[PDB]
Every structure is written in C-alpha cells, then in structure tokens.
Amino acid sequence: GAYVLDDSDGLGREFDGIGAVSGGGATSRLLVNYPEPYRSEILDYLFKPNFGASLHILKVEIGGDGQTTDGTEPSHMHYELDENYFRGYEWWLMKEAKKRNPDIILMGLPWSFPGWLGKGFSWPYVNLQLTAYYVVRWILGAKHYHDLDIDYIGIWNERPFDANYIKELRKMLDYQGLQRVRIIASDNLWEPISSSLLLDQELWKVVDVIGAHYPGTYTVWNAKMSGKKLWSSEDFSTINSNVGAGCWSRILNQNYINGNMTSTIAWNLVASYYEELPYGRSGLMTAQEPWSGHYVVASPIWVSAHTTQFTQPGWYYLKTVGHLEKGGSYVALTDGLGNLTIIIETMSHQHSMCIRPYLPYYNVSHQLATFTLKGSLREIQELQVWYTKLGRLHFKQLDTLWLLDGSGSFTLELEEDEIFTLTTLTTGRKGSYPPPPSSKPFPTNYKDDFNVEYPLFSEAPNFADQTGVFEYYMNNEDREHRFTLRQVLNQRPITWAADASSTISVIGDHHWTNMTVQCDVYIETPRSGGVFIAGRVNKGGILIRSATGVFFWIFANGSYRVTADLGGWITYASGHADVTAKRWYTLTLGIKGYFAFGMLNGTILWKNVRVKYPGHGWAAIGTHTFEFAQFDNFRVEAAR
Ligand SMILES: *[C@@H]1O[C@H](CO)[C@@H](O[C@@H]2O[C@H](CO)[C@@H](O)[C@H](O)[C@H]2NC(C)=O)[C@H](O)[C@H]1NC(C)=O
Numbered sequence: 001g002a003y004v005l006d007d008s009d010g011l012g013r014e015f016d017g018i019g020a021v022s023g024g025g026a027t028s029r030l031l032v033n034y035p036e037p038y039r040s041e042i043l044d045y046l047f048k049p050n051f052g053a054s055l056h057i058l059k060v061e062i063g064g065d066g067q068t069t070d071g072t073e074p075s076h077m078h079y080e081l082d083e084n085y086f087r088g089y090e091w092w093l094m095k096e097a098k099k100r101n102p103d104i105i106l107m108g109l110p111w112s113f114p115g116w117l118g119k120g121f122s123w124p125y126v127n128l129q130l131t132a133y134y135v136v137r138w139i140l141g142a143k144h145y146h147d148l149d150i151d152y153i154g155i156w157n158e159r160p161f162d163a164n165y166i167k168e169l170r171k172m173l174d175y176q177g178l179q180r181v182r183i184i185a186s187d188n189l190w191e192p193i194s195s196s197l198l199l200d201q202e203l204w205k206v207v208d209v210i211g212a213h214y215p216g217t218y219t220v221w222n223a224k225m226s227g228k229k230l231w232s233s234e235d236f237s238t239i240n241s242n243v244g245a246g247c248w249s250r251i252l253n254q255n256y257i258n259g260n261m262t263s264t265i266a267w268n269l270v271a272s273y274y275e276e277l278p279y280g281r282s283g284l285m286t287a288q289e290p291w292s293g294h295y296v297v298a299s300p301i302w303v304s305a306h307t308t309q310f311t312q313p314g315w316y317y318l319k320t321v322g323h324l325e326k327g328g329s330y331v332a333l334t335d336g337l338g339n340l341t342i343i344i345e346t347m348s349h350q351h352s353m354c355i356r357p358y359l360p361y362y363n364v365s366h367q368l369a370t371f372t373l374k375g376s377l378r379e380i381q382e383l384q385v386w387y388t389k390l391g392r393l394h395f396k397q398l399d400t401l402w403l404l405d406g407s408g409s410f411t412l413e414l415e416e417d418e419i420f421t422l423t424t425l426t427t428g429r430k431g432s433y434p435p436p437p438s439s440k441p442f443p444t445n446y447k448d449d450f451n452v453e454y455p456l457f458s459e460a461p462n463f464a465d466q467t468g469v470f471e472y473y474m475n476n477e478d479r480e481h482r483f484t485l486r487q488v489l490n491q492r493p494i495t496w497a498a499d500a501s502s503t504i505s506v507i508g509d510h511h512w513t514n515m516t517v518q519c520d521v522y523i524e525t526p527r528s529g530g531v532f533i534a535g536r537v538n539k540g541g542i543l544i545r546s547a548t549g550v551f552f553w554i555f556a557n558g559s560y561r562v563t564a565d566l567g568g569w570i571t572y573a574s575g576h577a578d579v580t581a582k583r584w585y586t587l588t589l590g591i592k593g594y595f596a597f598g599m600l601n602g603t604i605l606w607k608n609v610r611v612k613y614p615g616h617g618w619a620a621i622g623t624h625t626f627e628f629a630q631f632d633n634f635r636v637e638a639a640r
C-alpha cells in the first residue's frame with residue numbers, strides 16, 4: 001500500500017556504478033571500422049553523459065591470444081621479450097570512453113594467456129611472479145602509452161583462482177607504484193572466494209571486491225559476512241530485444257535488493273560481432289555492419305539510462321528499498337546533497353527472462369503505489385519523471401509531479417513491464433542522432449590487398465580471428481608482397497575455450513552459399529607447414545572446433561587436401577601439388593551447389609568434387625597449426 005522512503009535512521013550501501021563488458025571475446029570487433037559520423041554516434045550512445053546508456057563502468061578483456069567466445073583478442077606479449085601496447089581495440093575503446101566521460105571506471109580482466117607463460121604447461125599458476133608480471137605490464141602500459149588509469153584488476157575469468165597468485169599480484173602492483181589499483185575476485189561463483197576470505201586474513205586484506213557471475217540477484221552468507229563490496233561483475237548476456245531489456249531492467253534493481261550487490265556489469269557492451277557467432281546480438285545495443293553504417297539503438301540502452309543518467313558512483317542506496325505488493329520492485333538513492341532518485345520496475349515474468357538463470361513463474365498485476373518521503377526527503381516537493389514501456393515507448397519524459405500539499409507523498413498507478421524514474425535531477429536527456437543507413441548484407445564482391453603502411457588498428461577490417469591472431473605485416477625485403485596479413489602465434493595459448501588445432505579467421509556473410517574465394521598464401525615453416533582457404537564455414541567462437549564447410553589445404557611437403565571440417569577428419573579430395581615453403585602461391589576455391597573446385601596459380605588442381613549441400617557460411621583463411629604464415633590480395637565473390 002504505502003512505501004516509506006526515509007533516511008533518518010541511516011543509509012544503505014554505497015552505489016558503485018553500472019557498466020558493461022568489452023571482450024570475452026572480440027565483441028567490439030566490427031565497431032572499429034565503422035565510418036564517421038556513425039562510429040562516434042555509437043560511442044556517444046554508450047558513454048556520453050546525459051545522452052544514452054551513460055555508463056559508469058567499462059570492463060575490457062586483457063587479450064591473451066586465445067579464443068574467448070566470439071573470437072580471439074591479441075595480447076601485449078605474444079612471445080617472451082615481446083611488448084607492444086598498440087594491438088587490438090580495447091586501448092582505443094577505453095580512450096573513447098574516457099573522452100566522453102573522464103570519470104568512467106575502468107577494469108581489466110584476463111580470459112586467456114599466451115602459452116609461453118605456462119612454461120610447458122597450460123596453466124597460469126606455474127610461475128606466479130611471471131603471470132603477475134605479465135598482467136601488471138598491461139596496467140603500466142595503459143598509463144604510459146594511453147594515459148589510462150586502470151581502476152580494477154581481476155584474476156582469471158570463470159576459472160580457478162590461486163590465493164598465492166592474488167597475494168603476489170598485490171605485492172607486484174605495490175612494487176610498481178600501483179597501490180591505487182584495486183583487486184576484484186574471482187569473477188566466477190561466490191565460492192570458494194567468499195569462504196577463503198573468512199579463513200585467511202592475508203587474502204581478505206588484498207581483495208577489495210567480490211565479483212560474482214550470473215548470481216540470479218542473490219548472494220550468500222559468507223559474502224555478506226566478509227563486509228566486502230559485492231558486484232554482479234558479469235550478468236545479462238541475453239538477446240537485446242524487449243525481453244532482454246526486461247531482464248536487464250529487473251536485475252538492475254533486484255541485484256541490490258535481493259543480493260546486496262552495489263554494481264552490475266553486462267556482458268556485453270555492444271554487439272559488434274557476426275550474429276551467427278555464439279550469443280549473437282547480446283549487447284546493450286547492436287552495431288554489426290561497419291560496411292553499411294547501420295546500427296540499432298536497442299531497448300537496453302534506455303533501460304540503463306533510467307539508472308545511469310540519474311545516479312553516480314558514490315551515491316548511497318536508501319535503507320528503504322524493496323518489492324511491490326503485487327510484483328516488481330523499487331530502489332532509491334541520494335547523493336547527500338539533497339538529490340533523490342527513485343527507480344521503479346514492474347517487469348513481468350514472460351517478458352524479462354534471462355538466459356542465466358531462468359526464474360520460476362511469478363505474478364505481476366496492476367497496482368497502486370503510495371510513496372511517502374521522510375527524514376531529509378520531506379522537504380522535497382518537486383520530482384522529474386521519466387517513463388518506459390516495453391512491448392513500445394522508450395525513455396519519454398512526463399509531466400513533473402508536485403508534492404506541494406506538505407504530505408511529502410504521492411501515488412502512482414502501475415501496470416506490467418514499465419519503468420519509472422523519479423528524480424530531483426534536471427539533467428536527463430533522451431539523446432538523439434538522425435537515423436543511420438538501412439541494413440545491408442556484406443558486399444557480394446569484396447577485396448583487400450592489405451596495403452596500409454601505418455594502419456590505425458593492428459588487424460585488417462572484418463577479419464574475425466577464431467583461433468590464432470592475424471596482423472598487418474610489413475616486409476621491406478619484398479616488393480610485390482611488402483604489405484601482407486600474417487598469423488603471428490607460434491604456440492597454443494593457455495586457453496579459455498577449446499581453440500582449434502588450426503588457426504582461422506572468418507569474414508563475410510554467414511548466409512553465403514555460392515562463393516569463390518581467392519588469396520595469395522605463403523608458408524613460412526619448411527617441410528611441415530600448411531595453410532588453407534575456405535568457404536561455407538558455419539560455426540565459430542566457442543564452437544570453432546566444430547566448424548564444417550569446404551577447406552582447401554596446401555602443405556610444404558608437396559601435397560593438398562580438401563576437407564569438410566576444420567579438424568581435417570573428413571576428406572573430400574586429396575593429392576600431390578607443386579608446393580614448398582617460403583614461396584608465394586595463389587589459391588582459388590570455388591563452391592557452387594553440390595560441387596567445388598580448386599586452383600593453384602590459376603590452373604585447375606581439382607574440380608567437380610562433391611561437397612555437402614545445402615550448406616552456408618563465411619569465407620576464411622588459416623594455418624595448419626600455430627605457425628607463421630602470410631596472406632595477400634584477398635578476394636571473395638559470393639551469392640547469398
Ligand atoms: C543485505 O541485504 C539484505 C536484504 O536482502 C538485508 O537483510 C535484511 O532485510 C530485511 C528485509 O529483507 C530487513 O527488514 C532487515 O532490516 C535487513 N537486515 C538488517 C540488518 O537491516 C541485509 O541487511 C543486507 N546486509 C548487509 C550486510 O548489508
């Protein structure tokens with residue numbers, strides 16, 4: 001009936017912010033080659049204050065060269081003695097975020113590590129000091145090369161932690177003058193990190209935040225006992241339709257109400273990766289067409305705004321938050337300066353299902369809510385009102401509510417799937433740019449000669465690495481092939497996912513059925529080396545080992561194979577070929593209906609080879625194992 005909002009008996013927990021994840025893996029891959037002004041507009045919708053999502057927190061993957069869900073991300077240390085702080089796009093993303101919002105909170109976390117750290121094993125805790133050294137170098141580089149202060153460092157995403165590692169990382173940070181950097185652990189479940197902190201005083205002193213993944217709005221007793229800040233350091237991960245926006249809306253409120261969590265961070269920031277990769281379109285918005293410029297400002301963007309535009313890190317929750325009598329919830333926050341924000345959600349079960357977990361049915365029906373301000377809140381007599389309805393009307397501002405009659409009280413009629421924000425703040429704004437170009441398929445004719453002398457990014461556009469890492473490469477010794485694309489991993493990473501045994505980068509339109517793919521290739525390893533081109537590649541990311549399609553391989557021992565699968569278990573054709581190492585060859589692969597053919601230097605090597613049909617997928621290039629190889633003058637023609 002009536003809900004008392006008071007602060008006279010004190011406040012609840014400090015609010016730490018709302019944010020999102022870029023990474024785990026290659027989720028921002030397709031954003032970097034958006035043309036202007038669209039790329040800038042997209043970043044504004046995400047990071048610009050008082051405009052769109054206005055995010056408080058940005059969390060990025062610390063690339064380790066392994067596959068980490070929708071691709072691989074490059075590391076700052078590919079090999080021992082290698083350091084480079086200009087690979088990939090997370091540096092760039094963090095800088096764009098800081099330009100728009102200097103107060104944004106930055107976090108780094110590893111998913112995978114380069115193999116050389118394991119010293120023969122695939123384990124990051126063999127040499128604690130070395131792994132900490134690797135991680136701390138990343139934090140230093142962010143400062144020295146991009147003027148970025150990293151606020152939080154994590155351990156190993158959804159993977160076991162090592163208590164001695166966490167202690168060494170703290171020791172190492174301090175040694176490098178990074179006392180300011182805080183540690184969050186362990187980006188997995190509540191246990192065993194929570195009990196470990198109660199049993200080990202030394203561990204407790206070095207962990208600042210307990211971050212848990214997909215907690216279902218609840219926490220556990222040991223985490224409450226620790227007295228640490230508790231965050232949902234990864235949540236959401238749901239398609240950004242209205243139902244994903246509902247999920248996001250409900251948990252933003254109820255993570256604090258049910259679980260004492262004072263921050264929630266969504267995976268992922270923006271869907272800039274091919275939709276047919278795992279968890280397609282699971283970002284706060286969509287930008288998966290840099291060639292057309294088309295992007296979609298999805299419902300979750302405005303759901304966020306209901307909290308982010310009217311709260312800041314350092315505000316406090318009121319003690320008086322809770323559930324509504326007939327479904328839904330409410331939270332309230334102040335800044336200690338006279339401001340008050342009230343956020344109300346009535347998301348129904350049918351329209352707010354998250355993928356993890358799925359909630360047992362709960363009823364939500366029409367109701368009346370009376371709110372009464374007490375304590376310092378009593379003198380408030382004016383409140384701005386923002387409204388959203390999911391089904392649809394987004395972040396529309398309504399008429400001001402006045403509490404002039406001295407009752408410090410007001411009443412709202414609530415229905416299902418609504419959000420209300422009531423605040424004393426006048427700065428709210430539904431940001432708006434003109435509509436972007438219409439959606440268009442990947443170009444049916446496409447070419448890249450990789451001839452860029454000073455590239456803005458370390459990899460050519462639209463190539464999404466799914467195992468291994470491909471980079472622009474300048475070779476001054478060669479005139480015809482001075483500027484190529486090169487696979488630079490020479491050993492299997494300490495993996496997060498099940499990376500393939502072969503490296504591979506995919507590109508184009510997953511709908512493609514008929515295609516001709518051409519590329520110049522160069523095998524660097526004598527006798528044992530091999531490369532391939534392919535089409536109809538149907539799976540990537542987490543499932544990259546599963547990929548079928550048509551694969552045209554050549555090897556430096558003088559042979560070729562044609563396979564249905566990346567793993568090379570199923571043969572379509574095979575034979576001998578005039579192929580050696582350290583020599584440029586032109587491969588062509590044509591696939592039409594039931595049949596395929598392959599050319600070596602413009603001459604037929606095999607043709608009319610039966611392949612599975614119907615079938616569809618991307619084009620791709622790659623190498624037999626983790627080995628150096630170069631690629632040049634890529635072209636693809638295809639019918640969708
Ligand atoms: C964590 O939040 C929970 C809410 O889920 C708090 O537990 C109590 O909640 C009930 C109603 O759910 C209130 O009537 C109690 O007053 C709350 N407890 C106290 C001590 O006030 C709990 O307080 C929170 N825990 C911490 C450590 O902040």
Ligand SMILES: *[C@@H]1O[C@H](CO)[C@@H](O[C@@H]2O[C@H](CO)[C@@H](O)[C@H](O)[C@H]2NC(C)=O)[C@H](O)[C@H]1NC(C)=O
Binds near residue numbers: 424
């Ligand atoms: C609500 O918040 C605003 C913004 O934080 C407060 O306004 C600021 O007040 C400080 C001093 O208290 C000034 O230094 C800033 O320049 C002000 N900024 C703006 C944008 O006005 C305001 O005092 C808070 N309280 C109320 C009742 O509005």
Ligand SMILES: *[C@@H]1O[C@H](CO)[C@@H](O)[C@H](O)[C@H]1NC(C)=O
Binds near residue numbers: 363364365
């Ligand atoms: C939900 O609640 C309303 C009002 O109490 C009731 O009429 C309706 O039958 C309920 N539905 C379910 C599925 O419980």
Ligand SMILES: OC[C@H]1NC[C@@H](O)[C@H]1O
Binds near residue numbers: 023024025068237279
């Ligand atoms: O829900 C899937 C997400 N969890 C970890 C992140 O990398 C994604 O795989």
Ligand SMILES: [Ca+2]
Binds near residue numbers: 449451481482484632
């Ligand atoms: Ca070239």
